[PDB]
């Protein structure tokens, strides 16, 4: 009972490249080309990884060419490392959770390191607040973008956790990224990120 159907969770295949502390980089920025990054963190003492997914949105397929996973990053320096890839992807704009860590992230962002694109729900939310309904949907938009073959994964610790994610409520950080994503998809908003500048 995955989320994602048996016989496209089969075909998925990675790349395996090269973990640079955390860091894996399947395709360098590209001019013109337009990316959005969203970031699920890790909360408070447990088992899990901060996840930063880069996916190329300028036309379809989407892309995921790069991804930052870690359980070692130091919490002085996860806004900088943040900071680091969004400016590498053509100044890509983020969509970061706001559980508590997000909340921290992204003001250190907006305050900190006077980064631009933050993708804000709200002016008091600056990144995706939590809620129920936006898991759900961003996991019914995800199934379909692999389903139909609209976003092309990579990344081996993604599909690991892809291929163990229940279709109802094991490390989940990657996927939960991606559900993010998936959200941010069926937005009004998401016209302003995605395609070529006109
Ligand atoms: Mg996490």
């Known amino acids: 009972g995955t989320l994602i159907r048996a016989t496209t969770l089969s075909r998925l295949s990675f790349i395996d490249v090269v973990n640079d ?15 959005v990054a969203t970031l699920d963190c890790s909360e408070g003492r447990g088992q899990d990884y901060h996840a ?20 070692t990053t130091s919490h002085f320096i996860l806004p900088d ?5 969004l400016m590498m992807y053509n100044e890509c704009p983020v969509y970061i959770e706001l559980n508590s860590t997000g909340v ?11 980064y631009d694109n933050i993708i804000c729900d709200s002016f008091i939310d600056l990144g995706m607040k939590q809620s129920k309904r936006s898991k759900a949907m961003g996991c019914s938009a995800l199934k379909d973008l692999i389903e139909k073959d609209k976003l092309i994964i990579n990344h081996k610790g ?11 409520g094991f490390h989940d950080d990657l996927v939960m990224s991606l559900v993010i994503f ?13 395609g070529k500048d006109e």
């Open 158 to 168: 993604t599909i690991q956790e892809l291929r163990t994610f229940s279709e109802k």
């Open 81 to 85: 490392i943040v900071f680091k890839y």
């Open 182 to 194: 998936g959200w941010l998809t069926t937005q009004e908003k998401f016209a302003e990120y995605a």
């Open 52 to 71: 930063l997914q880069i996916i190329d949105i300028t036309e379809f397929p989407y892309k995921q060419v790069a991804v930052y996973h870690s359980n």
């Open 21 to 35: 502390n955390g860091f894996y980089q399947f395709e360098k920025p590209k001019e013109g080309r337009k990316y």
């Open 104 to 114: 921290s992230i992204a003001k250190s962002l907006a305050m900190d390191l006077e």
